[PDB]
């Protein structure tokens, strides 16, 4: 079970630090938590007003990865539009609390499956909640979360990209470092790396359904601007 190379330990440091500096409320998300009261456009309203800072945190995460910063702005835009809801969904799923059955948004707002579903997310709310439940036994630390985020960001198959092959190599570096970190961490769950790769697929489905749903059916001034831009 190969463990992290030194060049991979500093990539682990770079990514973990980027995640921790752009992750809302850091460790005090549970205490700061505030429980909230077809589509409820009033529930919708409350959610659209609170997605802008969550999108901005993803932008900030990416900007703290030098490999991201090396790409042309046209590719940076494409990578961020692709992975934004994938990372927001992971960051909320890892904050699943089984006792209240809530996820935490912006490190401060606890929401139920029914609330998020009626905020306009539909089946995506069940997919995010199910992921959170499945992730409770994975005991993902900040490093494992940051690396998953970095794998999702460096997706070479987003349409319209120019630097397809450089982005692929960035991702291969992250995947190798991450598997080696997982070897070092020796989790007590069988076939951990294969099961983690299935969780990536789960997040990609959330990203592809999110994007599809925006497109579908829906007055757009009612949507935050940064959120119209990411669909």
């Amino acid at each position: 079970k190969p463990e992290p190379t030194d060049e991979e330990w500093e990539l682990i440091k770079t990514v973990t630090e980027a995640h921790v500096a752009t992750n809302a409320q850091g460790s005090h998300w549970k205490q700061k938590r505030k429980f909230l009261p077809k589509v409820d456009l009033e529930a919708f309203s409350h959610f659209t007003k609170i997605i802008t800072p969550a999108i901005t945190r993803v932008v900030d995460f990416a900007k703290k990865l030098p490999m991201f910063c090396e790409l042309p702005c046209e590719d940076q835009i494409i990578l961020l539009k692709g992975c934004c809801m994938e990372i927001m969904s992971l960051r909320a799923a890892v904050r699943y609390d089984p006792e209240s059955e809530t996820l935490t948004l912006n490190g401060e707002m606890a929401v139920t499956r029914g609330q998020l579903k009626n905020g306009g997310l539909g089946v995506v709310s069940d997919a995010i909640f199910d992921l959170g439940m499945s992730l409770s036994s994975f005991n993902l630390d900040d490093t494992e979360v940051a690396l998953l985020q970095a794998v999702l960001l460096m997706s070479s198959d987003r349409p319209g990209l120019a630097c397809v092959e450089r982005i692929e190599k960035y991702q291969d570096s992250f995947l190798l470092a991450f598997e080696h970190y997982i070897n070092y961490r020796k989790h007590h769950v069988t076939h951990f790396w294969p099961k983690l790769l299935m969780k990536v697929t789960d997040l990609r489905m959330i990203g592809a359904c999110h994007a599809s749903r925006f497109l579908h059916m829906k007055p757009t001034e009612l949507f935050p601007p940064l959120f119209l831009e990411v669909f």
């Binding site: 702005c73 940076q76 835009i77 961020l80 539009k81 940064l226 831009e229």
Partner: peptide, 11 residues
């Protein structure tokens, strides 16, 4: 298009 995101990226 993608002009807020562009501003936020280029700093």
């Amino acid at each position: 298009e993608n002009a807020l995101l562009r501003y936020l990226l280029d700093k």
